[PDB]
Ligand binder design. Structure first.
Ligand SMILES: Cc1ccc(S(=O)(=O)Nc2ccc3c(c2)N(C2CC2)C(C)(C)C(=O)N3C)cc1
Length: 124
């Protein structure tokens, strides 16, 4: 009941190594990675392990920091806005499937605020 995770490599996609993309890996992702609340987001949702077979009935564009990290390490992105957009998908997924109040949402909201704070200023 687990779909194939998002791709982390795609030879036919044009890639760039921009300064902002390096920053997103170095500074932004690797900071969020170490947060107390990062652990549920460090790998795809395992609907089987969690016995939540309804998760992928609801969430149709899955994303996680582990996938984003692998995309960054593999230079998958063209620009930073593309990466940021995957971050936003991850957070939105969590808010979609869960409800205000839920502990997983407090974690997501907390990570998000750190995330927004970190990307408020990107390198030139
Ligand atoms: C506070 C907390 C409670 C349970 C767990 S977990 O061990 O079960 N592992 C786990 C990892 C990621 C998620 C979830 C569980 N849930 C929430 C129902 C929990 C869903 C599927 C919705 C989610 O969107 N994400 C992002 C971790 C933290």
């Amino acid at each position: 009941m687990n779909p194939p995770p998002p791709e982390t490599s795609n030879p036919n996609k044009p890639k760039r190594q921009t300064n902002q993309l390096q920053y997103l890996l170095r500074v932004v992702l690797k900071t969020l990675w170490k947060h107390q609340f990062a652990w549920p987001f460090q790998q795809p949702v395992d609907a089987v392990k969690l016995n939540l077979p309804d998760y992928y009935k609801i969430i149709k564009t899955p994303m996680d920091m582990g996938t984003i990290k692998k995309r960054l390490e593999n230079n998958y992105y063209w620009n930073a806005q593309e990466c940021i957009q995957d971050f936003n998908t991850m957070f939105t997924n969590c808010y979609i499937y869960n409800k205000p109040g839920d502990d997983i949402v407090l974690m997501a909201e907390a990570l998000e605020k750190l995330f927004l704070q970190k990307i408020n200023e990107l390198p030139t």
